[PDB]
Amino acid sequence: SSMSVSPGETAKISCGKESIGSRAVQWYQQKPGQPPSLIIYNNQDRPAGVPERFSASPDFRPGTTATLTITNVDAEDEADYYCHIYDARGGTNWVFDRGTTLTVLGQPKAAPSVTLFPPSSEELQANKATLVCLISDFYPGAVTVAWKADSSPVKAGVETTTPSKQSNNKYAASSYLSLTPEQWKSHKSYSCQVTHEGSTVEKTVAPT
Amino acid sequence: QLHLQESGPGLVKPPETLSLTCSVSGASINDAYWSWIRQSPGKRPEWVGYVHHSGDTNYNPSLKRRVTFSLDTAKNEVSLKLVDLTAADSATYFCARALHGKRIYGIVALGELFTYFYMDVWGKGTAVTVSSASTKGPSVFPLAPSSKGGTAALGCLVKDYFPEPVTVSWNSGALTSGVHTFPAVLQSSGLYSLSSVVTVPSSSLGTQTYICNVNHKPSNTKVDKRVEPK
Ligand SMILES: [Zn+2]
Ligand SMILES: [Zn+2]
Ligand SMILES: [Zn+2]
Ligand SMILES: [Zn+2]
Ligand SMILES: [Zn+2]
Ligand SMILES: [Zn+2]
Ligand SMILES: [Zn+2]
Ligand SMILES: [Zn+2]
Ligand SMILES: [Zn+2]
Ligand SMILES: [Zn+2]
Ligand SMILES: [Zn+2]
Ligand SMILES: [Zn+2]
C-alpha cells in the first residue's frame, strides 16, 4: 500500500476490516533499518514521548474501520505503519495488518526506465530459458510488475526483488521469468508490464 | 534504562535446529512478560509467542508444535528453540517486553471483558538463514545489445550460485559509469542469481570491446566474459 504527501500537510490512514465485536487496537511505526516502535495503544491512548500530531479513533460501535491521523507532517514521518487488532467476536490476530508505505516528498516525481532481454542461444543449448526485466530511476520507491504471454496472464514461475536505494535517492528493482525452450517457441510474444502510480509502461520480445 | 540484545548462529544447515538468546539489562526476568517476533524482507511482522514465570504462556498456531521458550535466572536470559526447519524459517528475529491490559465493555461477572498485549521496548534483532544446499560457483551468460535515443544497453546474467556474496566489475574497473549492478533473487532451487548492465553510445559498437569480470570467493572461482553485438 502506497501514499505520498508534502511537508506541512495532513495524512489519514485506514487499517484492517470492519469490526464485529468491541475492539482494542495498537499502532506501530518502522523506519529503514530499524525495529518497529509503538505509537498508539488501547485505540486512542498515547505512550510518553510520542508527539501530539499523532492521534487515532476510539471504539464506539460495530461496523467501523480503525483510522490514524498525522497533522503537520514532518520529513521524519517517512515510514511503514502497521496495526494489531484484538476483537471480542473475531478473535486474536497473530500477524500485523497493513496501513501504508508513506513517502514525504522532497523532489519531483519520476517515471521508471525499463529494459527487457530475451534468452541467449548459449543458454538454449544448455536446455534452459530465462527472461530478464530491469527497472531503474523511479521516485517515489514503489511499483508493481505483471507478465503476459500473447495476451494472457502468467503468474506461475516468476521471482521479483524488493526496491533498493540508488546513490541519487531514486530506486531500482528486478523481475525474472523461467521457461522451457519448447514454451519459448510455442507463443508469439512475451511482455513485461510495470505500473508506478496508476500509469503503466510495457516492453515486448519475440523468438524471431 | 531498559535495554535488550539478541544473539544467534547465522547460517544453519537443516538436520540441525535453531537456538537463540536474548540478554536483558535493567530489570529482572521475573518482573515481566517476554515476546519474540519475526519478519521476512518486504513482509508483515509475525508474532511467535510469550512467556511468564508463573506459566501463563502461549504460542502461535502456525508453528506451535516445534517452538518453545525458557528462562535462566543466573544469566538473566530469555531463550528460543525451533526444530524441523525448512527454508521458510529464514528471517530476522526480535525480542521484546510485553505489557498487558484489560478491555471492559460490560458486566465483569458475565465475562464481558478480555486480555490484550502491547510491546514498548525492542532489540535490534538477529538475521537467520536456513539452507540445505552445497557450495557452487556461477554460470555466466551474455545479454547482447540490438543493432536497431542513440544508445544501447548490454550486460551479464550471473546464474545459480551459493552462497552470497559475488563481486562484479567492467573492463577491469576502467568503466565505472553507466553501470547498474542489481541485487539477487532466490529461486525454489536454493541458489542465487543477479545481473549487471551498462548503457553505451551506439556509434561505437564496431570499435569497442566490453568485458565483465566476476569473482566468487567462497568457491575460489573467477570468470571473464566478452559481450558482443549480433
Ligand atoms: Zn486482516
Ligand atoms: Zn462497508
Ligand atoms: Zn476503549
Ligand atoms: Zn479476543
Ligand atoms: Zn510514474
Ligand atoms: Zn537502463
Ligand atoms: Zn499457452
Ligand atoms: Zn509470581
Ligand atoms: Zn493478567
Ligand atoms: Zn545509470
Ligand atoms: Zn519462490
Ligand atoms: Zn580479470
Residue numbers in the entry:
A (entry chain A): 8 to 9, 11 to 67, 67A, 67B, 67C, 68 to 92, 96 to 98, 98A, ...
B (entry chain B): 1 to 82, 82A, 82B, 82C, 83 to 100, 100A, 100B, 100C, ...
Paper text:
At an IC50<50 µg/mL, this family of bnAbs neutralizes 65–70% of HIV-1 isolates and also recognizes an N332-sensitive epitope. One of the main characteristics of the paratope is a 24-residue HCDR3 that forms an extended anti-parallel β-hairpin with either a type-1 β-turn at its tip for PGT121 and PGT123 or a distorted 310-helix at its tip for PGT122.
Two residues in the elongated conserved face 2 are critical for HIV-1 neutralization for all three antibodies: TyrH100B and GluH100I. The drastic effect of mutating either one of these two residues to alanine in PGT121, PGT122 and PGT123 is suggestive that this conserved portion of the paratope is the primary determinant for antigen contact, and, hence, for HIV-1 neutralization. Alanine-mutagenesis experiments in the PGT121 paratope were performed to show that the residues that contact the complex glycan in the crystal structure are indeed responsible for binding complex sugars on the glycan array. In addition, PGT122 and PGT123 do not have a lysine at this position, but rather an Asp and a His, respectively, which might help to explain why these antibodies are not reactive with complex glycans on a glycan array. While sCD4 bound to the SOSIP.664 trimer with a Kd of 579 nM in the absence of PGT123 Fab, there was negligible binding in presence of PGT123 Fab. The reverse sequential binding experiment also revealed that PGT123 Fab was not able to bind SOSIP.664 trimer after pre-incubation with sCD4, despite binding the unliganded SOSIP.664 trimer with a Kd of 990 nM. Also noteworthy is the lower binding affinity of PGT123 Fab and sCD4 for the SOSIP.664 trimer, compared to the gp120 monomer.
